Design an enzyme around this catalytic site. Sequence first.
Site, PDB file in Angstrom:
ATOM      1  N   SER A 180      -8.592  11.514 -25.497  1.00 41.05           N
ATOM      2  CA  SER A 180      -8.176  10.633 -24.427  1.00 41.05           C
ATOM      3  C   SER A 180      -7.115  11.325 -23.571  1.00 41.05           C
ATOM      4  O   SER A 180      -6.047  11.673 -24.061  1.00 41.05           O
ATOM      5  CB  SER A 180      -7.590   9.368 -25.015  1.00 41.05           C
ATOM      6  OG  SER A 180      -7.120   8.519 -23.984  1.00 41.05           O
ATOM      7  N   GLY A 181      -7.390  11.513 -22.292  1.00 37.30           N
ATOM      8  CA  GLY A 181      -6.416  12.164 -21.439  1.00 37.30           C
ATOM      9  C   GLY A 181      -6.686  13.651 -21.297  1.00 37.30           C
ATOM     10  O   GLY A 181      -5.918  14.391 -20.687  1.00 37.30           O
ATOM     11  N   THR A 185     -13.054  12.221 -17.372  1.00 36.27           N
ATOM     12  CA  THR A 185     -13.368  11.431 -16.189  1.00 36.27           C
ATOM     13  C   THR A 185     -13.165  12.225 -14.885  1.00 36.27           C
ATOM     14  O   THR A 185     -13.918  12.049 -13.930  1.00 36.27           O
ATOM     15  CB  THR A 185     -12.513  10.112 -16.173  1.00 36.27           C
ATOM     16  OG1 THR A 185     -12.861   9.300 -17.301  1.00 36.27           O
ATOM     17  CG2 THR A 185     -12.746   9.313 -14.919  1.00 36.27           C
ATOM     18  N   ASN A 232      -3.001   8.030 -21.610  1.00 32.75           N
ATOM     19  CA  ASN A 232      -3.529   8.244 -20.262  1.00 32.75           C
ATOM     20  C   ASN A 232      -3.235   7.061 -19.328  1.00 32.75           C
ATOM     21  O   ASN A 232      -3.558   5.920 -19.638  1.00 32.75           O
ATOM     22  CB  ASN A 232      -5.038   8.482 -20.356  1.00 32.75           C
ATOM     23  CG  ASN A 232      -5.691   8.795 -19.015  1.00 32.75           C
ATOM     24  OD1 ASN A 232      -6.854   9.162 -18.975  1.00 32.75           O
ATOM     25  ND2 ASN A 232      -4.958   8.656 -17.930  1.00 32.75           N
ATOM     26  N   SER A 235      -6.753   5.656 -18.554  1.00 32.01           N
ATOM     27  CA  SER A 235      -7.676   5.749 -19.676  1.00 32.01           C
ATOM     28  C   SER A 235      -8.991   4.982 -19.508  1.00 32.01           C
ATOM     29  O   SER A 235      -9.017   3.889 -18.945  1.00 32.01           O
ATOM     30  CB  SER A 235      -6.956   5.276 -20.937  1.00 32.01           C
ATOM     31  OG  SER A 235      -7.849   5.173 -22.015  1.00 32.01           O
ATOM     32  N   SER A 236     -10.085   5.568 -19.985  1.00 33.62           N
ATOM     33  CA  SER A 236     -11.383   4.911 -19.910  1.00 33.62           C
ATOM     34  C   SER A 236     -11.548   4.181 -21.227  1.00 33.62           C
ATOM     35  O   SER A 236     -11.415   4.775 -22.294  1.00 33.62           O
ATOM     36  CB  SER A 236     -12.508   5.929 -19.725  1.00 33.62           C
ATOM     37  OG  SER A 236     -12.428   6.576 -18.466  1.00 33.62           O
ATOM     38  N   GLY A 456     -14.453  12.106 -27.922  1.00 35.90           N
ATOM     39  CA  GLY A 456     -14.926  12.858 -29.066  1.00 35.90           C
ATOM     40  C   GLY A 456     -14.442  12.090 -30.282  1.00 35.90           C
ATOM     41  O   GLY A 456     -14.021  10.939 -30.150  1.00 35.90           O
ATOM     42  N   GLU A 458     -12.490  10.252 -33.139  1.00 31.49           N
ATOM     43  CA  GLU A 458     -11.193   9.578 -33.096  1.00 31.49           C
ATOM     44  C   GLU A 458     -10.627   9.484 -34.505  1.00 31.49           C
ATOM     45  O   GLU A 458     -11.323   9.101 -35.438  1.00 31.49           O
ATOM     46  CB  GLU A 458     -11.304   8.169 -32.488  1.00 31.49           C
ATOM     47  CG  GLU A 458     -11.590   8.149 -30.986  1.00 31.49           C
ATOM     48  CD  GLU A 458     -11.485   6.750 -30.352  1.00 31.49           C
ATOM     49  OE1 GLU A 458     -12.155   5.806 -30.839  1.00 31.49           O
ATOM     50  OE2 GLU A 458     -10.737   6.600 -29.359  1.00 31.49           O
TER      51      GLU A 458
HETATM   52  N1  LIG Z   1      -8.751  18.816 -13.095  1.00 37.74           N
HETATM   53  C1  LIG Z   1      -7.666  18.105 -12.950  1.00 37.74           C
HETATM   54  N2  LIG Z   1      -6.788  18.310 -11.851  1.00 37.74           N
HETATM   55  C2  LIG Z   1      -5.632  17.511 -11.761  1.00 37.74           C
HETATM   56  N3  LIG Z   1      -5.267  16.544 -12.633  1.00 37.74           N
HETATM   57  C3  LIG Z   1      -6.187  16.403 -13.690  1.00 37.74           C
HETATM   58  C4  LIG Z   1      -7.339  17.119 -13.883  1.00 37.74           C
HETATM   59  N4  LIG Z   1      -7.991  16.717 -15.018  1.00 37.74           N
HETATM   60  C5  LIG Z   1      -7.258  15.787 -15.496  1.00 37.74           C
HETATM   61  N5  LIG Z   1      -6.151  15.528 -14.764  1.00 37.74           N
HETATM   62  C6  LIG Z   1      -5.055  14.568 -15.075  1.00 37.74           C
HETATM   63  O1  LIG Z   1      -5.335  13.953 -16.345  1.00 37.74           O
HETATM   64  C7  LIG Z   1      -5.375  12.559 -16.158  1.00 37.74           C
HETATM   65  C8  LIG Z   1      -6.341  12.092 -17.197  1.00 37.74           C
HETATM   66  O2  LIG Z   1      -7.633  12.634 -16.858  1.00 37.74           O
HETATM   67  P1  LIG Z   1      -8.912  11.801 -17.272  1.00 37.74           P
HETATM   68  O3  LIG Z   1     -10.075  12.484 -16.662  1.00 37.74           O
HETATM   69  O4  LIG Z   1      -8.726  10.382 -16.932  1.00 37.74           O
HETATM   70  O5  LIG Z   1      -8.952  11.866 -18.881  1.00 37.74           O
HETATM   71  P2  LIG Z   1     -10.101  11.377 -19.867  1.00 37.74           P
HETATM   72  O6  LIG Z   1     -11.206  11.020 -18.975  1.00 37.74           O
HETATM   73  O7  LIG Z   1     -10.378  12.388 -20.921  1.00 37.74           O
HETATM   74  O8  LIG Z   1      -9.571  10.155 -20.647  1.00 37.74           O
HETATM   75  C9  LIG Z   1      -5.843  12.457 -14.735  1.00 37.74           C
HETATM   76  O9  LIG Z   1      -5.993  11.165 -14.148  1.00 37.74           O
HETATM   77  C10 LIG Z   1      -4.929  13.432 -14.090  1.00 37.74           C
HETATM   78  O10 LIG Z   1      -3.648  12.926 -13.875  1.00 37.74           O
HETATM   79 MG   LIG Z   2     -11.934   8.791 -19.450  1.00 33.94          MG
END
Ligand SMILES: Nc1ncnc2c1ncn2[C@@H]1O[C@H](COP(=O)(O)OP(=O)(O)O)[C@@H](O)[C@H]1O
Ligand SMILES: [Mg+2]
Lengths: 1009, 1009
Positions: A180-181, A185, A232, A235-236, A456, A458
């Site tokens: 997560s984070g 996404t 996050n 977070s999704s 992935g 948990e």
């Molecule tokens: N490629 C990137 N460039 C800039 N910030 C990023 C990038 N990837 C992730 N982040 C940062 O990480 C935060 C969490 O990313 P996210 O995709 O929401 O995580 P996940 O989907 O794994 O839970 C983003 O909203 C942003 O602040």
């Molecule tokens: Mg997500």
Amino acid sequence: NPIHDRTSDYHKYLKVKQGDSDLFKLTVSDKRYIWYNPDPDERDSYECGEIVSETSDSFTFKTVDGQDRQVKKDDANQRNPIKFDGVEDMSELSYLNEPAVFHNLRVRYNQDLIYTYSGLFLVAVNPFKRIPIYTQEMVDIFKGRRRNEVAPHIFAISDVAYRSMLDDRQNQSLLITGESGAGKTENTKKVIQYLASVAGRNQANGSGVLEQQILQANPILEAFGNAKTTRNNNSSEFGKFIEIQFNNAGFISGASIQSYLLEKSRVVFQSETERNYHIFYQLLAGATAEEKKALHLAGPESFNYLNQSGCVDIKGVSDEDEFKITRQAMDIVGFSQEEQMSIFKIIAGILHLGNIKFEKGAGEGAVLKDKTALNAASTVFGVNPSVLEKALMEPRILAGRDLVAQHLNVEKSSSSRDALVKALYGRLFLWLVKKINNVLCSERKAYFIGVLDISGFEIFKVNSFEQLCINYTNEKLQQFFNHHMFKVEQEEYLKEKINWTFIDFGLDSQATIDLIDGRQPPGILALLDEQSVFPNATDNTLITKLHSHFSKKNAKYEEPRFSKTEFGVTHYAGQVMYEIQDWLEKNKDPLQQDLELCFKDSSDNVVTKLFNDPNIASRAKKGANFITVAAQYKEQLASLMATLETTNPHFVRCIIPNNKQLPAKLEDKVVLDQLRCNGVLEGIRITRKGFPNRIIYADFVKRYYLLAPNVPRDAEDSQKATDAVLKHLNIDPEQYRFGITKIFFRAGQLARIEEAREQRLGSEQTKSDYLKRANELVQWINDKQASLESRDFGDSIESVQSFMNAHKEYKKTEKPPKGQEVSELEAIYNSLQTKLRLIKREPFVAPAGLTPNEIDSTWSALEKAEQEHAEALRIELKRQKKIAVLLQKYNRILKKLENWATTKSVYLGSNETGDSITAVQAKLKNLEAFDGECQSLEGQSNSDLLSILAQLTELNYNGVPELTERKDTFFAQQWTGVKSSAETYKNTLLAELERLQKIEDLHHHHHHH
Amino acid sequence: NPIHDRTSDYHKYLKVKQGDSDLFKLTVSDKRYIWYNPDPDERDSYECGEIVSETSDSFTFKTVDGQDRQVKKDDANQRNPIKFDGVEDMSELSYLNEPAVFHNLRVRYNQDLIYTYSGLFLVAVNPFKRIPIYTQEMVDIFKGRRRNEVAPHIFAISDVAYRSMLDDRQNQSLLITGESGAGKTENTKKVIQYLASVAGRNQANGSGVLEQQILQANPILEAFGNAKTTRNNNSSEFGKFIEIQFNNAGFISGASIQSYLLEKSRVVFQSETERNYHIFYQLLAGATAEEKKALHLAGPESFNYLNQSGCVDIKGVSDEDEFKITRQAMDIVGFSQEEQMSIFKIIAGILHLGNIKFEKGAGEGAVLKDKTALNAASTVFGVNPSVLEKALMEPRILAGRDLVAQHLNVEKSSSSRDALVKALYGRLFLWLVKKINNVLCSERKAYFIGVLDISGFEIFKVNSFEQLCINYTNEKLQQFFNHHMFKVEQEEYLKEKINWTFIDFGLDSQATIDLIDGRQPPGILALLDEQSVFPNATDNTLITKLHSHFSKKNAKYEEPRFSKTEFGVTHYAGQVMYEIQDWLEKNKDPLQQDLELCFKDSSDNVVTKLFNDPNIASRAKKGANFITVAAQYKEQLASLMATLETTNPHFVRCIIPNNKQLPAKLEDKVVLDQLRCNGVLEGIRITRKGFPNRIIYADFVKRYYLLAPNVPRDAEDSQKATDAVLKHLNIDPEQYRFGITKIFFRAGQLARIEEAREQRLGSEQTKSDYLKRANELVQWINDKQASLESRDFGDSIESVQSFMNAHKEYKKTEKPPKGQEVSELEAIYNSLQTKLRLIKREPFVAPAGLTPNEIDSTWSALEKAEQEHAEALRIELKRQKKIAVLLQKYNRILKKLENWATTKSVYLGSNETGDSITAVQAKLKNLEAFDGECQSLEGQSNSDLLSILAQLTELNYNGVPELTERKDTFFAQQWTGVKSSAETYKNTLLAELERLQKIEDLHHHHHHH
Ligand SMILES: Nc1ncnc2c1ncn2[C@@H]1O[C@H](COP(=O)(O)OP(=O)(O)O)[C@@H](O)[C@H]1O
Ligand SMILES: [Mg+2]
Ligand SMILES: [Mg+2]
């Protein structure tokens, strides 16, 4: 084509910054290091030390600190040669060990290079800050380019997926996982950005609005499925499998979205510091005065479901702005104003339903001494408050075939409410996805590229039923990836015709998969299904059945030796301890029939559709007791898996650099753990086993040609030139294989060859530096000796001593450093001569006088000249001193006569007083005492002056001339001037005696007169 | 009218939660508390306790445990009586303490009442949460209302000032000061919001344009002058003076603005957690992709000036939303599109300059290896990177009379660059301001209300020059206040006609002012101007000069003993230690002249104005020299105080509730300190000197009439009534003063009076509790007695024994309670009499029956009935078991008889061996021996029983008749049975013999035969 231009932004942000040099002299160091942990305590901490020496099978190294340690070659984690730092693919590393892999990742990360391949994997480390590599220019740079023709990038993976769809006429899938984070996404959006760009059809009034609708779907779902959590800010809270549909020609024609495990529980409870789902805050902030009053809206401060975390804002987010952005999205996707208001009504209702306080009253039952909330909810929902009030505290249960009202108390009535909310929310989310799909999905589609965006494995400190579902899902993906890997890796060995086959493989996930979803015998999920249908049964009757079915009966199961509420299964990523608490109800997901009946009659379009459409209001259909929750998920996953199996997969693994959402902070404990569970490291441990390094002959020769006698870097028969090198380096033939187009190497072999090259160029650099230092030294000696061989020293007593004073200086200050150099160059010479012995190279043959033997003799000569110079000085001081005593004597004698030539000048020039032959002539008896002394004072003085002169002459004193002159000038001057003066005293004092003899007898002629 | 309607928003959000019965129902307690320090450690932490018993010298109070401490009555801090809690004006408090002032502030803040008055001050505590008190409806409530007619509010002050303007034809000013984040800027926005409502040209043609602009100017300045700090997420890094200009009729006609001490150092440096000025972040985040690749923009952390704090975001704020708002506002005000891009290019350039990295050159000077930044900067700025490079590193000095360039060391190279950046930023801001003033200002203004939004006294760990400029400014303002407070205070006493003279207290405000801005003798600033133009003068040279001019002389100056670099001055708010470092540079604020030339020739329109227009680029030239920063400031403050003294002033004091930006957490330590420095506690110290409390006569009587006998709640003559109350309570006429309209009281007096009202109400209540408990008591005593005096204890032992056990229980359960009550009602009656003496009224005289003495008697009588009761029981158990013994004796007798008669009844029913005249007449004797005893039993027995009946009749055993019958029966039942039955036996024996002797007789005739 900025790909070829060190100054382009593509090189600035996606390529490892080099020193822009292809030739040589780039490697000024050739030591061999090893990765070790100082204190065996922190397994993930690493330091590298210089290999001091090695035996038949065990290195010995100098810890960065001091003390030396030793390890057996078998366990040794050697550091890869510097040329491997920053490689675009871990598979290119020769030494393939954990600290090596992590190191390359660090190297790339400190340069903001966040994408790196590892075999089939695209590893993407979260940067936690914006990097300019997602611009349209960057997009255009990736079109049609091939994976190994450009730098690692989410865009590269996307294009290859797309070209394969076209060129293979087969479906593709992008599986993006991680913690997560980690950034799942964000990369997922990029994939869709890239696709909308290279395959979206332009205008034509309606054909290009489709690309807009697809992209706008996410803003909607994000508002309802995302929330701020400790890990996050966005977070999704649900799994997602997007599917982009294409037609024969290759243009986007539609898309469909699939939702998974939406965490409904968040709607009624938040851990401190978190937030509820975004729309809640977006509505209460972006709503308008009418909308606010119509919905009875207030502020977050006044809603239970929104004011127990002590957090209502997000760093950098304007909920006011978001609402508008969300409203806009719904507009483009096609939601009517009626529907939107109905949607925000449900969000409003949920808020109010959480404000219903159930106090205890007479009869210890449950009362509701207030209706504000109840009414507000009812009003927006569209249902009479009277029925709802009933359905909440006094649901009508069925005792047999006749139903009779019950009366839940307080906490049981509270839960009932909590469940209407969770139910209401889950169903609304599903309605949205369903609604979106209806607009974007095309029933018939040539091909599709799916993007799976889910977490992935948990493993929290407390894992419940939700956790078993996700870890179960990843057991299947991991297995799906293992099968694809061994598939694609074997096809490589065939293409090149390399006779090699695996024999290791990684113990499958089938056993663990079964322990969970097995049929005969029954798995954990079967039992839970069994145990949740048999009348009187609780959480404790469930775990019990599990222990008896698996404990010491299945290797993947575990009955904890210190708890009777938990049990653990051994997943790919390690063992997880699951807490049986609440599973029966979670799998049952219960809602009072009275509550369904209530809302079933709502005056709202959307609400009524939430409780009337069975495709939304209920699960499958058994024919008596609808499918369970666990049963429903198992079916969905089964569906997802069958879809993925009809596609060519692409795996993207996202890694979080630390647990503090910080940029520039890659923490090894954190990274390494992720790499031990996401398959990246297991993957390397497996391929490491065969021939991981593959190089195209020409490229091999271009770099190592100089290690063999006469091969050119551009040798026309690469394969044969490669054999030459391998033979010359006498490499072990078992370490490689001649592929059809590439040369295969086992682990470590390439590194060893690369070390040879470093040793070589190092060999020549040393040879070079030595010549420069050897000469600068010989030269210095030749110059000093020259100076010491001279004999000027000048000419006084203070002059020679200043030279003696300098020689003492050059022996205390300058000599020493030049001496060290002599013995230091000798050390260097012999080392080099020995190094050249191995390395299979010719012995070093230095110039004329730069051999350690000749430099030694040359130095002995300077030492011999130093002494002769010393002796020369002492002897010149002797002379110089003698000369000073003789000069003093000379000067004195003259300073004498000079004074006498003035004292006696007052004798001759000074007369008497009185005329006669008593005070006049009877006194010139002294003049005869005078010229009697000034005839010896000459004969004795001039005799000494000469004796002194001869001596000075005998001391080759170049100054005699001016001496002899000052002397001669004296005698022929002052001395004579007064020597002659004695005349006008002996003649004038005998002339006045003429008038004392002639005028004396005029008084003598009286004796005759 | 919202004001008089206890259900309207006004009453819910701006009024303390009252009641509706001014009659008698709100003061149930009459205990006098006091404010103390639980732990003498913390001076600003308090706890209230009860007053034990004062002395004619001091008090005595119980803590919150049992630590009864004593305090000097002339030092104590009494807690005001409940009636004062929540007063809208601090000066209405009787006891004027610090913990007292705080308590009031807290009672109000806890109900969300953030505004409170204190003398001339309007105190405003930040609520750190939104409160619905700034709506247009609220606004409407304040039109033409007087400060005392409506609740405290920033709107009241605004309207009062607006009326005064139009009414008096005099300029007004509102001065808002307070710590950082206290709420100064928010309230300033309200003052203006309000002024636009009541004075804005409604909304005619283009009339509603000026005001639309005056409002829009804020988003602009805040974007360039505000930033996120540890104290405020939106800290104004500059002071301001707004001038709202109105015409003859009161219509807004213009507005002017003025900036003070814009902290330029922030652009180049920021502490951990803070941010640079907002625009930097708004630009990078809100720039369109084209604008991004036109200014060479990148992410926040890619710029040195922006990535040194670790912070780049703000809770709830979106830098892109804000950027749009800033641009949009700039349009409304007039900035053409050209100008706007010019402004963003300068902001962009500053950022770029930050990245230019200087480094040790080939020698000791400095050089620039990477030219990316420099070039970028030059590009947007519109200057030759060629000269820019030279002006920075190789500036031309004017040594001698020529222009000999130089070479600064890396260190001094960066400073110059940091100097250019700040110069660039200060001039742009100053420029934006003038531009805003061009559009809004008008030289023809009938009147004006000026609002001063500026910081209060600053006292940080390390204070420098800037702090001095701010503390000096607050010295003037605090002296301006005191002059206005003295003036208004004597006005209230003169009118109302009370002979009272206050002091002027200002004798050291000048002392501190002069020590700072003094000329002769020279003040700190004079010595800094001088020293600043003395060759080779250094920081440590100025600190020494300062010491030999004030140390151990001017009583406000001070030389620390440890620090050599520090010095302290005593300000209105306490000792402030000032660090001398950098002052000479700050006061001079240099900028290499070559850097002026490079930009003077800028191709950019705006950049040119900033370097060519002397109104921006220069302080002001006296010709012979320039004005120092200190002088420049000195004149600007002078210009301000000049304007402020041509106005009627209104003072607002902002206070921050705590240091954690959280709601509902007012903290004593934090607040009190501020109250102690912003002049509020001082004012209260002075206000406490004369006659603080002043109540209208009729208002006084309406409440304290009950204190003086026979005085009505009304009275045509309120004054006589007031007097009749003061005299009756016996009060020193030095403690009050009869005003013409109202009665004046000295600190503490009105409270003592209110404490008397409390005590009467208390007395009256005690007097009521007593009767309720007495009457109940006696009615109970009376009944137990009538109970106990009963003598019907039933009939056997059991009966009587139960009454004995019941008497035992009574004396151990039901009695003890009634015992205490008796003696506790006595204490209450005793205490009640003592009190009634001090309140100065009639002694209590309970109804006949009730009263300690009569209660004792009633209880004594009960104590007797109890004793006579037990004795009666004792004497009755004796009689009962005395009867028991006789009853047993009686029964035993009847038993014997019964069981005997039954035995002698079998005997009298069988004749089996009486066949012989000899055996029969003998068996008839045994029948006579039977009639012998049967007679001597029927006689003795009937005599015994009879004796027992007579004994029972002496014990009054009313169960006699029942016993006799039982007797008389036997002797007519069983007894008469055997008796007769006896005959049956006899009349059979008599016969069998008679008819046998007949045989033996006629048979005796055998004598013949
Ligand atoms: N490629 C990137 N460039 C800039 N910030 C990023 C990038 N990837 C992730 N982040 C940062 O990480 C935060 C969490 O990313 P996210 O995709 O929401 O995580 P996940 O989907 O794994 O839970 C983003 O909203 C942003 O602040
Ligand atoms: Mg997500
Ligand atoms: Mg401010």
